[model samples]
Target: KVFQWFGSNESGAEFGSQNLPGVEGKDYIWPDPNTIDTLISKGMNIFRVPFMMERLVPNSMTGSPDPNYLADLIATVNAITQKGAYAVVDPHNYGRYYNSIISSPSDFQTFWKTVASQFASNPLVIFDTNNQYHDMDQTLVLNLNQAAIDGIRSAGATSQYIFVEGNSWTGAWTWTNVNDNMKSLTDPSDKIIYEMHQFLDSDGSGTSATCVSSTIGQERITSATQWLRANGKKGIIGEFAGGANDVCETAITGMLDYMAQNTDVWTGAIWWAAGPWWGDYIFSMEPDNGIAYQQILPILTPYL
Candidate 1:
């Protein structure tokens, strides 16, 4: 499953909103059926749709999603599923980003219960409990995942795959800590999958800038997979992006090559952005110099 680029839906601040030409909201015309078709035609089988809980559920504290937005979201999913593509409904904004307060396991349970109730019958839709659940200890992350499982099952979603991520941006270095707590979940289901992220180079933030040698990178993948298998967990490279240099490309390609070589252990990967998001200097995945869309598309076609 290739990670489709983030769609510029109603949740995110787009390039137009950011005043960058051809950058923000480049192809984000939501509810437009063609966007879904384009992705399916590109050989993408899975799309992770990141959305804001606050935007979709204005009174989320009340555990109710806005009816109209829920309807629109369902319509969007219907459009995508019509093309035989699966969608993962990801709450990109959790904690303070959505609720303006630090989110706790209880809050997450309430949110997933609502989400599961809404899309439980949609076979193509999965619930990614939250995006990048960082800053919490391993125990807390596990508890949160358990809460989500309970919520989903209680809401009558018996089969939707539930995706959970490790701490610290799902980095390879933190996998052990993340998985230790993950293994503690009771009533573990085959629908549970582990998600992690990898960046080619550090973003100069000191902590997130560590680089892995090719040997070390390969070893990390192996170790992560071995741990998952031993614990009966499925693994997915939820987010990975080529850094700003050749090293970044090398790191990403190395991981991809490794996955291709071991498809049975690793399920899939998703490239970071289809367009610019962080800084223009960060991993844009496209040529820095302006070029024709046709030119850029071909360059990215092989990676997809």
Candidate 2:
């Protein structure tokens, strides 16, 4: 289904609090219960909860993650599922650890296996290996993704829809490249879904309020969408959103409509975010003291 980064973590400095270690970190509950209500009330259905992996697995190739970290994540996931929305747990490590490219799959696999084993019974949870992989070797990312798939399934998460993405920051335009390798990925249930992220702004980065144009939003995913349709594989936009400007509105609406029309291939998409951490971010989707920070409901409600 269409998913949004419903909750984004704080800066790396606050990573400690996500696990709550010695008063050093604070447990995270993005969108809280109230914001979740906002989404469902507005017709949204899924949440992409992005978090820093360093705090959980510091060494991707090593032992299990912090116990408290897993607990925190589990509670959050439970909260979402209880609300009747899907929760996508994303290790927001950008294909790297400590600013270095991830050169091995062992670490990634271990992380997923550990996590999947814990949540194997949670049908509403999805495991997205990592957020975005960029400026790195595609081979390494592909291997890492493969490792995650194998590890998760082997660890008994056979029933979960493990979300996997391609290289170059999981860009929608680069789907073909990732598809060349990801299409061969095997799952015990054969229910895996390819993941893609698209933003309408210049450079396809949703960081800014300005967009290249309205048409590019829907235009950008054309090739990727066609690829999924022909391959008999399902895909989802793990992350997507834009500013409240007219251009962004048109682009966002158009892309949503495009996906709705091509349901055979596009399973769904999630907006970038609406959470406590946004704190007035230009594109924040939550309400800021009653002020409308993101006004895409008109566009989202139609498809939801």
Candidate 3:
């Protein structure tokens, strides 16, 4: 099946914004292996592990990664891949370095090169160039994405998929309108997959528990789907979520159904998200009280 990857974002490692380059166990935590194992037991085959870029490359965008943070991150990736699941290494920085926006494409290029080189031997490690980029020049977004792609390939991690996001938080609803230029991005290995995020809230921000409508999920992704078809490229829903209710349930399923029916341009989707720290964050998929099992997993399990 072309809809090959399906999973959730294990997001605790990127926590504690106040504590940049935070202490591991106190300030920030890695995704719990038990949580990952539980999800894998339920048939998930991919896990997006988000990390703070500042933690990884604390010195500079192009500098060496912090040994401690990089070590734990590598251990997490290895744990997921060793279990035969794809691990998406996501730098959840939103196209910025510390507080400032990164303006140079070469900085991003070299950053990705340094990071990707660590997992060059593991094809199961998917390199998500960056998390949702926003509030930046669209042309710069394209250049940064292309630079990351080039860097990944130069690192010799040519076998794995490289996911590239766009401007405006990489929202699927505004994809064609704001990110049409992203279609021009190229990859040396031709494995660049466009990644987008969507939510069912009235504003599509994912902060509220109420979904906009039963059909809103599919409606929001329509333009992005059309764009992918027209461009002859592949895409993935890197992040999506809804509240625990029948309206949200149907809407979320409708979105997945649309992707299922259009496998030619859609590869997969990863829910946002499943992590230990999100005790009751509404959209969390964490195995204990998270809503994925009760709300979204029944549908996703079949595909996983």
Candidate 4:
């Protein structure tokens, strides 16, 4: 399962807005089809195309997504597919913004149904049910997963993998909830992939900060893999962002190296920021002299 990148929202940076000519407020254009081609040329096989479903189908209840936005999104997907790279259509934004409570379960169901119907035949495009539905109950997560499964099936999407995220923003601390309550879809043909996000924190706010230390991080990784395997599900670390400071970067590299060694259990990991945010203390993977890309890329080269 590929980590779905967030494209744009009215408030934050929008991928299509930045790159697409004639589109308003496109901050990060994702280069061009040629830039995508170049990345593929560099041996990047999987690309996550994140976009807001609401932007595509504002206030849409069912049927097809907003036709014009859907057309642009499909065009982007087609271009990636043409370049021989697999693309995941991730709904980075659904009915609400990040960390907001999800309401109206029926609305979510209808939205997914429309999405599945629109991209039913695209082999390279997978449906990510929602971006980060945090602070929700187990019942809601299970119910939403079921609704998404039904939507995709009803839309005739038999083969595409449907990625399901756990509540509490898919963090590992809620692994027990994810493992115990989130039931797998009954359909044998449709596949389910679990996602988890990790970030730095002091009081176990995001993920376990102790989980990043040399000994604890590796142990946590092993425990996480074992838990996933015992539950009979596939798992991936969807988001991980850490800093370049010695203590933090060391821990980040150690954990990643441990993960790299145990790739059989952990599918893959994506670093958070390729640009900038949250001041210089947060993770930024650009070509800066002492950033995650420069400091950790050498350690990750073998794994990549």
Candidate 5:
């Protein structure tokens, strides 16, 4: 149980980039309960469900949440948590709101405050500050994370873990170089865990199926692991994936095994994705009808 939590990201409500406040079925969809139950039965214990920030609070970062969207999000979280698994309430906005970088920390802060208030009753609902923030000042990212931490605790969601991501797409390889400043972020509840993402592809973007090498896993996360251990902080590979090949499998397993060996600072990982609509997407871990992904599950379930 070194990596105490292991699972996949249930992605869907973050879709429909062009359609603001889009229709549920056409533009966005919630993670299927059947899918969650299936994965739970397979020994997975956490599900990171990403949602469009705009859809959650349309038009403004601190605006009132759309009732329909909020309802679905709550239901989605309930579906996973009711089964004794942790559900990550992820805002998959990449540190922006409606195509513009959030210029004010208070805006991001208020957004999380409201979100935390709504889910404060359920400690199992983990709050991920944001997803893959990039192309911004690193200091701003640190401030934004701090603001979110303040917001969440202020709303009384202090018992839950807050997964904080840094700039440069929150990539593991660039963590020390681009996100080193995030170490300064503080949490009153002391429940902050750095969330880093990594992919085995050549460029680390996860857009390709070819892996650079089997040892690439440990190589990519070396600096990140050092940062966590040196700071005496806990962390997780919030996102990571590989193709259905021997090279990618070895790389993925290698990365996970490294975390297992260093569980003192590394808690666990949630795979890049699994959603109802991700039909044949290269990294789709979503089950087909109820069958697990043959290529990926075997490599990942061992950690779970």
Candidate 6:
């Protein structure tokens, strides 16, 4: 019921121990011991953690999986689960491995199966397939998504949610169009949910900090929201961003308000900026000292 970037994306945390690299004066740690408690106090329980494929699967062919990377994943999720919260592991690679399409969906499934197998019993650790896939055929993409879903179940990791997405940027507004044949997707656990991103920019991209209008946020989600309700489906906004302007403030507030009203259709709403790597990224939701960005706390806290 809360939204935040507690993991704040990956800091230079080394694998295995996840010993975060330090900044000038302090360690650039994520979900700092105190921070986890703060999230619990605010009714915020879910966090987004992003990682790179290069580091995760160095030896793809052997399928042995990187022990260090697995340790880090288990450690990070353990940190969140220990505090009675959930973690979303995002392979923020935009549907590519090392800047290209992965060899095959079967190949992609290998990565997911390993992850699902490791955290299968822990409902707190959700596996997000990939981030914003683009430039790939829609059918091919869905096949890949299905492949991973199958692999997870075949590996006996049931009763866990696998956050799959529509193809071509996975935009919330275009979910119906970008994805097709989802009726064919089957999860023995019946716990699959759609993952989508929605932004306030004119083009619905997060690049520009400016918002075209306040209603656009609600408008963009309206169609998708209706679809989710009509089909008896669930979804999560894996990524959404906006500026600090009054217009965007009202727009994002309206979006949050809309989601709160339709909890059945929307399982969660996640902000895009949260991580050690952001380092002043314009969309970051985290603040320093008492300084804040986007002035979204007042509007968002109510939802949390």
Spell out the clash pairs found in candidate 5: none
Q: Cα miss at 107, model 1 (Å)? A: 3.6
Listed in order, each prediction's TM-score against the native is 0.75, 0.87, 0.97, 0.75, 0.97, 0.85
* 1-304 per-residue lDDT for model 3 (tens digits): 3378888899889999779878888888899898899999887788999999999999688888899999999999999999999999999999998878889999999999999999999989999988999999899999999999999999999999999999999999999888988888888788888999999999888899899899999999998998999999999999999888889988988899999999989888889999888887888899877866566677665576
Residue-wise lDDT of candidate 5 within 1-304, one digit each (tens)? 5577898999999898789878999998999999789889888889999999999998887889999999999999999999999999999988888888887999898999999999998979999999999999888889889989999998989889999999989999998887777888888888899999998888889898889998898899998999999988999998888888888888888888888889899989988888899887888878763222656787676776
The candidate maximizing lDDT is 3
User: Which digits, one per residue and each the tens of the lDDT, describe model 1 over residues 1-304?
Assistant: 3333222222232223222112214522233455446645756666666655665665444467766556757776777667777777776653334335434778777777888888888777777767676665667767777888888888888877777766666665567755566766654445777776655444412233234543344545777767777887667776654434344435545666676666555677754443323334243332233121222234345556
In terms of TM-score, how similar is model 4 to the real structure?
0.75
Model 5 is weakest, by summed lDDT over 10 consecutive residues, at 287-296
State the lDDT of candidate 2 residue by residue for 1-304, as single tens digits.
Answer: 3433233221222334435232323444434656666666666667777766666665544676777656667777787778777788888778877667878688678777887888898888888888887787767777888899888988888778888888878889777865466677777788778888988778877778777888877998999998887778888887877777788788888887887788887888776666665566665666433112346655565566
lDDT per residue for candidate 4 within 1-304, as digits (tens), equals 2222221111122344323222423443321455456445434455555666555665454535666667767777787777666666767753253325456567777777788887788776667777666656777777777787787878888888777777767765556645467745555564777766656555434433233454334444565666677877766666665545455656666666776665555666655544222234334343343254466555545444
Per-residue lDDT for 8 in model 1? 20
Mark the 10 consecutive residues where model 4 has the least summed lDDT: 3-12
What is the TM-score of candidate 5? 0.97
What is the lDDT for 44 in model 1? 61
Clashing pairs in 2: 1-268, 2-268, 2-269, 3-269, 3-270, 4-270, 4-271, 17-25, 17-26
Please state every model's RMSD to the true fold in angstroms.
Answer: 5.7, 3.5, 1.2, 5.4, 1.3, 4.5
Candidate 1 runs further than 4 Å off: 1-32, 94-104, 186-189, 203-220, 243-246, 275-304
Worst 10 residues of 6 by lDDT: 16-25
RMSD of 3: 1.2
Off by over 4 Å in 6: 1-33, 287-294
lDDT of each: 0.58, 0.72, 0.89, 0.57, 0.88, 0.69
TM-score of 1: 0.75
